[PDB]
């Protein structure tokens, strides 16, 4: 299932290994594989979330595909405990889609021009930019120097890997108001999917180790 | 399927996400989900091997359940890039289970007593310590303390979550005649898992990226 | 300076590069490298601690040399975030050094054998096995097979680099009480260390992101 | 020292713990710190670099503060065992200062229009850009949305510390001619400034390890 986000953009599960009980197994390090024991097996997920011991959690793995503006995976790729692989615009002729903002994306700011007029400048500006790197592109410069003038709104493209602990921080710290808004919007779909496919490591996260203010109510 | 390695200890995998494909689809950032094009994406894992452009591999996740002697774990423990969760004995009562060195493993060395007395005189002193260890539990010792009088040699298990590309790591150091030859037995086991689940990538790792000196023949 | 710990254990700090100066220089990533600014310095490092915004400390990064007994030093290396290099039992004879707890470490537990005997029998089985690691040394047994039967208590030594960031969830984990006695006893001496070196980070550490119940009161 | 780097870039070392010497005293684990040992220290260094055991240079840390374009930072940023800290365009103005390569970048491409008109073309399109930034953040528009028009040749600026043995994969991969031109150019500082700090390192990671086609003649 893809979710969009933004105006181009999406987030999309690729793959996953594990669900709850995975970290319950490597907690209790078990030869035993059989069903669900909610009771018990809820108990231990809290009493790891509420004390901190979360390399448990680290046994369960997700991989995303994410389209995203430059200037949101700039942020993003801040988060060294995962991996990344990203499309070039060395090796690849990048594609005309950029980010232009909603007139809604000022809602709160007194400005001395118009909203609507805000989104015509950007929109104006990334169409010169792309126009120019294809004037380059045509005449022969290599594509690794031309797309130095396109624009951080761009989107590019990248798969994620990552564990539920290491997701867990990213959204201590993206799904948060403190986080710029458009990061924001993809750190709420990551939790949706989490939330999806780990309830009960979800529930504890949010009942005692979430550090945000957006994804509790 | 469980591999059965020195006398008591073993590795199973338990969980595996992503195969070959994962990685030729991370390198290009697939949004095609299509079979195997055996040709095409050999080539690129050839590629990428040979070049050293690895990141891709680490969309490859395997969970393996190990039982080994500690101080095997301990070396294997050095290994940072991966997720380890261990059976403590500050919380449980650990078992009689200690590797004895086959009278083979001494093949090479010229001793003054004969290698079946050095086999004897190992069981003798880990029956010695076990009783002092059961001795100080039943006595009303914290397991935390009692344990600390048991011998390196005690087998411990634990689940090892890890990539495709800090396993080929792995291989390269512990599946080479310098490593001890007991965790070489365990490298040779987790080796054979891997070329097993990821039959491309890992005829690609002997080709052009193994450092070691046991895999090729 | 070289902190006792233990009966026969140490830590040394052996190096350190910055202070709280070279937090506060990244955060604001300065040109300039004049003297201490403490009010305004400080106020930034607790906003810092405040809020989670701790990648400035990875900028202060320690080496210590410690010795402690192995039972410690499995714990300690499980931290993955440093960086360690330790005494080999394979490549060198290991000395005839072991922790031996005082009577006082079974404080508040009711034992069927008085504190003083715990002592001498677990004194009576490492020398025990001792002794079988030196007989099987001089036989001719290889020092990577003879020293298996020695017990978790011998001491060993090694160098661990650490940033501060790390040095702080270290901290957090090993300087509390649900840790083991032996490990917080490490942790209260690297903490002392930390505060002498950094006083500032040390300070707003432990009002704002220190999560243990040791080292406030 | 600051090396200047492209048009208007550096690379500066800030701080530096260790040196040759921090690497073996690691591996020994030793108690002793006395003068240099030209020929044992050499040998040893040599040794751990001919055979992969490169754990005891992780011992000695480097600080830089770099400034460089956005493009050539988002693929250092992707060396992730380091540490950065980045100046934030949420936060701050950003100045106007762009590289613009010089007519000799295109050497050896042949193209349609001049080398001097290319370089004319990229000026305009960075005055434009920049200029439409200022009107919006003199309207009104918060910085965190009017700097996603600014282009990827903006220059930035951070402090990275890095310690020896993931600054020689950093130059493995930098210091080479599949790596972009610009990145080159800072790898070459880089490369200088490591070799002036820690010069038996320097001479047998180029003799044994270095995988790159620059650095060696
Ligand atoms: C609101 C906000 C404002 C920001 N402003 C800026 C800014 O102005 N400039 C800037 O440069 N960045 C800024 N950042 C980025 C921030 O500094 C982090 O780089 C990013 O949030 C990733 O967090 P992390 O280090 O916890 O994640 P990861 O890099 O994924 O690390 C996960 C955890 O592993 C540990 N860890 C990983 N590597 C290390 C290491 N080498 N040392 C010690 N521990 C390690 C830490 O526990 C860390 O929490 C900001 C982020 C936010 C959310
Ligand atoms: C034959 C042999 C003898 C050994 N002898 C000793 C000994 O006497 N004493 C001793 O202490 N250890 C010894 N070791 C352990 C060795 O020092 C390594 O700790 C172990 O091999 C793990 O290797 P690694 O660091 O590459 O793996 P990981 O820790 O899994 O790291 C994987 C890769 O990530 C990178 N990396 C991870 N963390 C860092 C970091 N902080 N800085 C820079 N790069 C990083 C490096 O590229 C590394 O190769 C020995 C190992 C072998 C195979
Ligand atoms: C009281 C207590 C009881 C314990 N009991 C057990 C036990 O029974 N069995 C057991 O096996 N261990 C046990 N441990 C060890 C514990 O599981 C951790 O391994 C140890 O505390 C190191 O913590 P860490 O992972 O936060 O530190 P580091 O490994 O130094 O990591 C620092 C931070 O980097 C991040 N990080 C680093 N690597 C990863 C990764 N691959 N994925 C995601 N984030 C990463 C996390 O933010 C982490 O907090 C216990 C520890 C304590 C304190
Ligand atoms: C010529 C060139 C072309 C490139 N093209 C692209 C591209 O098209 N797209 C793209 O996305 N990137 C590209 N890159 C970036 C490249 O994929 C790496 O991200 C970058 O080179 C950092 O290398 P690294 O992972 O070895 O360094 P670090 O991230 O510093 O890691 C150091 C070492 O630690 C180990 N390590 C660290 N983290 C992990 C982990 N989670 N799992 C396993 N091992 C780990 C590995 O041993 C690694 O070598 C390219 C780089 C080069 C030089
Ligand atoms: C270079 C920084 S990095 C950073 N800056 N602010 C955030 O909120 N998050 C981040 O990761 C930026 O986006 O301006
Ligand atoms: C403490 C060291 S660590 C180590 N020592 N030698 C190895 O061959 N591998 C390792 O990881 C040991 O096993 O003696
Ligand atoms: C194998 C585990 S690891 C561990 N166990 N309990 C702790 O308190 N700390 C740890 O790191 C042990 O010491 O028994
Ligand atoms: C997004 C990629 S990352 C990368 N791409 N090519 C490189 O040579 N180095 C890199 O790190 C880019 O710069 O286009």
Redesign the pocket.
């Known amino acids: 299932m893809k979710i969009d986000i933004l105006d181009k953009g999406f987030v999309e599960l690729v793959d996953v290994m594990g669900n709850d009980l995975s970290a319950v197994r490597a907690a209790r390090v078990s030869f035993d594989m059989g069903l669900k024991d909610e009771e018990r097996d809820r108990h231990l997920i809290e009493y790891l979330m509420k004390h901190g011991h979360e390399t448990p959690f680290e046994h369960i793995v997700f991989t995303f595909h994410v389209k995203a503006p430059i200037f949101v995976a700039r942020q993003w790729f801040r988060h060294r405990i995962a991996s990344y692989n990203?499309?070039?615009?060395?090796?690849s002729k990048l594609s005309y889609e950029f980010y232009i903002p909603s007139p809604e994306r000022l809602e709160g700011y007194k400005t001395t021009i118009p909203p609507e007029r805000v989104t015509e400048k950007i929109s104006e500006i990334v169409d010169k930019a792309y126009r120019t790197y294809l004037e380059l592109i045509e005449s022969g410069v290599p594509r690794?120097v031309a797309?130095i003038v396109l624009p951080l709104n761009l989107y590019?493209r990248f798969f994620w890997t990552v564990n539920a602990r290491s997701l867990m921080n990213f959204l201590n710290l993206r799904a948060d108001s403190h986080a710029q808004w458009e990061i924001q919007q993809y750190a709420l779909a990551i939790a949706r999917i989490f939330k999806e496919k780990c309830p009960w490591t979800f529930e504890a996260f949010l009942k005692y180790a979430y550090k945000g203010d957006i994804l509790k109510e």
């Open positions: 990203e499309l070039s615009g060395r090796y690794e797309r590019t």
